[PDB]
Every structure is written in structure tokens, then in C-alpha cells.
Amino acid sequence: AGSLVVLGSINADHILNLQSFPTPGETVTGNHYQVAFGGKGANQAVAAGRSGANIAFIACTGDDSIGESVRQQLATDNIDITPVSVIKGESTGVALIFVNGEGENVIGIHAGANAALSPALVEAQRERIANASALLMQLESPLESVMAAAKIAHQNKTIVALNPAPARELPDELLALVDIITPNETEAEKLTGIRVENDEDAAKAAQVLHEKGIRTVLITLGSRGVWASVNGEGQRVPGFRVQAVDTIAAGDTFNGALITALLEEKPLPEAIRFAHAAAAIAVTRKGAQPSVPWREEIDAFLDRQ
Amino acid sequence: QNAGSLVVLGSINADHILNLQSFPTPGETVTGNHYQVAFGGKGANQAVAAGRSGANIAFIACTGDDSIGESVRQQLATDNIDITPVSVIKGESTGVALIFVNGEGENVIGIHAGANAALSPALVEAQRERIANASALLMQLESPLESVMAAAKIAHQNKTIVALNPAPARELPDELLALVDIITPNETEAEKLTGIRVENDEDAAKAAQVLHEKGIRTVLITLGSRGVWASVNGEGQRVPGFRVQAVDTIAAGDTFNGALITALLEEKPLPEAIRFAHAAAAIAVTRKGAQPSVPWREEIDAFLDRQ
Numbered sequence A: 001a002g003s004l005v006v007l008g009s010i011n012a013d014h015i016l017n018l019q020s021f022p023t024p025g026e027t028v029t030g031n032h033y034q035v036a037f038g039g040k041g042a043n044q045a046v047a048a049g050r051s052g053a054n055i056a057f058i059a060c061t062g063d064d065s066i067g068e069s070v071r072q073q074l075a076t077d078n079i080d081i082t083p084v085s086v087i088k089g090e091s092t093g094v095a096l097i098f099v100n101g102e103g104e105n106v107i108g109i110h111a112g113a114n115a116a117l118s119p120a121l122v123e124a125q126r127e128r129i130a131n132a133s134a135l136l137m138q139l140e141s142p143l144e145s146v147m148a149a150a151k152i153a154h155q156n157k158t159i160v161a162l163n164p165a166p167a168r169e170l171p172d173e174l175l176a177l178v179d180i181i182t183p184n185e186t187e188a189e190k191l192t193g194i195r196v197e198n199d200e201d202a203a204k205a206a207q208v209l210h211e212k213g214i215r216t217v218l219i220t221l222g223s224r225g226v227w228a229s230v231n232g233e234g235q236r237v238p239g240f241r242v243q244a245v246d247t248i249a250a251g252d253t254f255n256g257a258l259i260t261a262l263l264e265e266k267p268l269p270e271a272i273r274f275a276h277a278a279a280a281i282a283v284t285r286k287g288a289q290p291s292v293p294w295r296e297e298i299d300a301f302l303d304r305q
Numbered sequence B: 001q002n003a004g005s006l007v008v009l010g011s012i013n014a015d016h017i018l019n020l021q022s023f024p025t026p027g028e029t030v031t032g033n034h035y036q037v038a039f040g041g042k043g044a045n046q047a048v049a050a051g052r053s054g055a056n057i058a059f060i061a062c063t064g065d066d067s068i069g070e071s072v073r074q075q076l077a078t079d080n081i082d083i084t085p086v087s088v089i090k091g092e093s094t095g096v097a098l099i100f101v102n103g104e105g106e107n108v109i110g111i112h113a114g115a116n117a118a119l120s121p122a123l124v125e126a127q128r129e130r131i132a133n134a135s136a137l138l139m140q141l142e143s144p145l146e147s148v149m150a151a152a153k154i155a156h157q158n159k160t161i162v163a164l165n166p167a168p169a170r171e172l173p174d175e176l177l178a179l180v181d182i183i184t185p186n187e188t189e190a191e192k193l194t195g196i197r198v199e200n201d202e203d204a205a206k207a208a209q210v211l212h213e214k215g216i217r218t219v220l221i222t223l224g225s226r227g228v229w230a231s232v233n234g235e236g237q238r239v240p241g242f243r244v245q246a247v248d249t250i251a252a253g254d255t256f257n258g259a260l261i262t263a264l265l266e267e268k269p270l271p272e273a274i275r276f277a278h279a280a281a282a283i284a285v286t287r288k289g290a291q292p293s294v295p296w297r298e299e300i301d302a303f304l305d306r307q
């Protein structure tokens, strides 16, 4: 299979499960607290690595203890971490997460070292990106850097996969360089101005993105699967049914597993199926990276289906 | 010389504070502009305020048998606090608080109780004599209610003044309220306890009357920047605080409580004592973090002797 390069963030997640989100000036006591590795970039790199991809990770951690700790872990996740830089005088990103009884969450992020992943660090990886089969990025890294990497990938026929999260508007200049975009419903609406409530809303949101120059649009619909569309022709690919416990990193797992499948030359529908399986398993576990399944587990899940 | 002895019974937390523009909304993700890890917990914040402002105080609390716990205990000892009553709970982690602070300076807090949940009636009973011989007992609501109740009863039977900062906000049984001598709710807490929303010196008085009838003689309802509505058995007087540029109001109330009791134990009349407390709190709101923002006595008097 071809080589994958993931460029993104690394976070130390602090997760507190509680009943309800604490309104202003208020205080709430949780029932479970967990400190686990997170960050969309790292989560997606782990999903790729564990699912069987040949992946290298471009990222930055701080020169702190947690940073050394996450780098050691990532290496055991089948990830080439040579491209992971240690930023002197900077702390490793941190995420403060609240989960209510309804499973919905609120995320506050301290970028830390992640804000140091600059266009300069990207240029230093020019050759790595040019020779890769695909480049997977999210929006927890500086936009200028994501833009720079996208241009290198474009100039070199390297597939550009962009998970537009966290939600935000993006310049047409970037969108034009994307081959595969994976917004969830809130992200699709934020990018196209179209709210996605049903499959019909999805198709209209996808059309906007196709017109922006993105050939493959995959709008994740949570438990409803995903609306897969290739230049206007699309359909919803249902996911698998499971009892959710924690959906943090569900989307990240979907992306990492998806690209692994595509790089193994599995047709899109099959690849999405592979991705849904990995994601389904992920939602039945707690924490971001701890809940990311391995290839053996994914295929097993698929075979028991 | 030394004023009466003060005993603070409450929580200990390690705060994880993220300053951001706007609190995020469901399913949302926001990037803040500043992150800080500092010592917190209403119990500890109030103990530090008392210690730093000059009180003779001992602290009944629990930390976990983790590194952060040993770290906070060592720090507390340097804040003029007798930490002999601080227990280390084996197999438990120290309390943690996750905090978001928006552009206006307000905050929201999510708490992982940890070892704080282990501060039991049994640990309180072990301090029976310490509480009985103290001039005052200061507590909050981040410790098990059963324990606060037990401590209140011991203090009551021994004429030990019971000062209760009813935070975080929640309803309390009449059985507890009856044992309180001084209660310091903020507006949301007053409303939560009396069912009366407080928005001005008319409502405050009405909320205060409800508490007086529950058996609490001294009711002090903090009004944020508007100071406090001080009331002793129906006779209420408003006491304005000081004007300063706020940066972080986390622990403003905690600082108020710790400084207040120190002033009262030095026999300063209530109005003066509240002024002393406002000064300490004012300084606290101009600094970041909970305990790091708590001022020392020298600083408090300076601030005062300059007004």
C-alpha cells in the first residue's frame, strides 16, 4: 500500500463525565475522570497506524514530560514519529473535556506546542509529503501550515484528505486543493451555510463542496453513518449499531481507518464500511486514543457481521 | 496576642484553568488563550486566605497519595497553616477541577472529588477535641454533607463559632442551617437556599430574613463588585467593596471568607472585618489562579492604609 502522512495536533486529554454542563458561575461534580492522550492529529495517526497503515506523523509536542510520554506511546502505535518535533520552551497541547449524561461534550483547547507547527516545519517535510500517497490533516494546526502542506501535496499528486474539525469557515484557496473532505454535520453546515438534517440536506451541502473543487465529500451523520458523494453522485452508507459509552474520537477513528482502507485499494464503499467498523468499536470504549481499535479487532468485527 | 484558633474543614483541588473568549457550546470546540495549573479547592483556598492574612489556623482535609497531593501539602505548610489535620488517602487521587474562564472573567467549574469524598464523619470525630477547642470552624460544600453536619454539631455543642460558605450552590437541610452562626452565600447561593432571587438591597434583606428565621444570626450575602449585604438578626447594612480592574475572580469569595474570619477572630467589629475582607478579595481579583492570587497580611494592610 502507499504511504500516509498525517499532519496535526497532539493533546493530553482531561475528561470529566458529569450529569449536566455547569451553567456560568456554577460548579458540578462528575462521576468519572480520565487523563488520556488526544488531539485530532494524534488520534487520526493512531487509528491509521493501528488499522495497518504505513504512516508517518508530522506534529509538535512540548519539551515537557507528557510530551516525551506521548511520543514513546505513538511509536508503539505503528507510527513513524521521526517527523514529530519537540518544541523547546513550550508545553504540550491540552484538552479539557466535559461529557454530560446525554453523551454530548464541550471541548476547551490549549494549543501549546501545536501552534508551533509552522509553514517552515512543513517545508522541512516537503520531500516526505511529495513522496506520500496521501496527506491527512485536521484544523487543530495553524491554517497557514495546513495550506502550505496542501499545496506541496497538490504539486506532487499526493492525495489531500481534510477533516475540517474543529468547525470553522475555510478559504476557497484551501478547499480547491482538497481531494477528500470529511465534515460532520455541524462542520458541513459551517462550510456551506446549509444545515444537514436529512439525506437531502447532505446532498445539497456536498454539492457546494463539489463546486468548491472537492471531488469526494463524506458527511458523517453520527449513528446514521455517512453521506458519501463523488462529484454529485452520492448515497448514505449506514454505520453499525452499538451501545455507545464515549464518542470522543469517533470521527478521528473514522478518518484514520478510512485512509488506510483506501490506500489498500479497497473501493470507497468498502473502505467506508471498514471505517464504520473501526469507529463503532471506538464508540464502545473510553478516551480518545485508548478507544482506537487494532486491525485484528476491526477485521474480527467485520467477520462477525 | 494570638487571636482565637481557627479550624478550616474542606476540599483540596488541583485546578486546570483555561482562559477563553466564550464558553464553548454543546458539540463545540474552542481554543483558549491561556492555560494554568494551580492549587485550588474552596477548603484550601479559604485556609490559605486565613493563613496568609494572619490567622492561627489548622486545616482538616484529605489529599490523595499522589505526587500532586504531597506537593499541595508542602505548599500549604508555607502558607502559615497547621496541616497536621490533613490526611493522605491511600489508593485515592487528589481532587481536580477543570475550569473555563471567558472574556468577561466569569467561570464554570467541573469537579473530580477524588480524596475529598473520603473526608468522613469518622475523620471528623477524630478531630473532635481540635474542633471543640477552636474559636471558630469554617466550612464549605465541597466535602460530604454528612461530615459538614457532624463537624457543625461538635462545634455547636462546644460554643465553637460555625461559619459556613454555602458553595457550590445547593439546598441545605434545616438541621444544618440551625447550627450556623455566620453564613456567606453569594447571590445564586442565597436564592438557592431561600428561593428568593437577590438583585438589590431589598431582596438581599428578604433573603437574609429567611436565613435568620432558619436560625442563622449573621448573614452576609456577597454581591460581587457591589460588596456585601451584611445582616445581623434582621438589621442589615450594605458594605461596598473596593474598585479594581478584575483579571480573575476565581477564589474571590474564598479569599473573602478566609480574611473575614481572621478579622473577626482579632475582635474587629463586623463592618471593619468585612472591609478587611473586601480588601483581601479585591487584591485577589486582580491576580490569576486561586491560591496564587491570595494576598498576604502585609499586602492587605498596605492596600487598606492607602485607601
Ligand SMILES: Nc1ncnc2c1ncn2[C@@H]1O[C@H](COP(=O)(O)OP(=O)(O)O)[C@@H](O)[C@H]1O
Binding pocket: A165, A184, A185, A220, A221, A222, A223, A225, A226, A239, A240, A241, A242, A244, A247, A248, A249, A250, A251, A252, A254, A275, A276, A277, A279, A280, A283
Ligand atoms: N452512535 C454511533 N454508533 C455507531 N457508530 C457511530 C456512532 N456515532 C458515530 N459513529 C461512527 O463514527 C463516525 C463519525 O461520527 P460523527 O459524530 O459524525 O463524527 P465526529 O466524531 O467527528 O463528531 C460515524 O460516521 C460512524 O462511523
Ligand SMILES: Nc1ncnc2c1ncn2[C@@H]1O[C@H](COP(=O)(O)OP(=O)(O)O)[C@@H](O)[C@H]1O
Binding pocket: B167, B186, B187, B222, B223, B224, B225, B227, B228, B241, B242, B243, B244, B246, B249, B251, B252, B253, B254, B256, B277, B278, B279, B281, B282, B285
Ligand atoms: N469585580 C470585583 N471587584 C472587587 N471585588 C470583588 C469583585 N468580585 C468579587 N469581589 C470580592 O469578593 C467577594 C465575593 O464575590 P462574589 O462574586 O459575590 O462571590 P463568589 O466569588 O463566591 O461568587 C466580594 O464581596 C468582594 O469583596
Ligand SMILES: OC[C@H]1O[C@H](O)[C@H](O)[C@@H]1O
Binding pocket: A011, A012, A013, A037, A038, A039, A040, A043, A095, A107, A140, A248, A249, A250, A252, A288
Ligand atoms: O476529536 C476528539 C479530540 O479533539 C480534541 O483535540 C481532543 O484532544 C480529542 O482527543
Ligand SMILES: OC[C@H]1O[C@H](O)[C@H](O)[C@@H]1O
Binding pocket: B011, B013, B014, B015, B039, B040, B041, B042, B045, B096, B097, B109, B142, B250, B251, B254, B290
Ligand atoms: O472557588 C474557587 C474554587 O472552586 C473549586 O473548588 C475550584 O477548585 C476552585 O479553586
Ligand code: ALF
Binding pocket: A176, A177, A178, A179, A180, A213, A214, A215, A216
Ligand atoms: F481539487 Al478537485 F475535484 F478534488 F478540483
Ligand code: ALF
Binding pocket: B178, B179, B180, B181, B182, B215, B216, B217, B218
Ligand atoms: F444558631 Al442561631 F441564631 F445562629 F439560632
Ligand SMILES: [Mg+2]
Binding pocket: A246, A247, A248, A249, A282, A283, A284, A285, A286, A287, A288, A291
Ligand atoms: Mg471511545
Ligand SMILES: [Mg+2]
Binding pocket: B247, B248, B249, B250, B284, B285, B286, B287, B288, B289, B293
Ligand atoms: Mg483572580
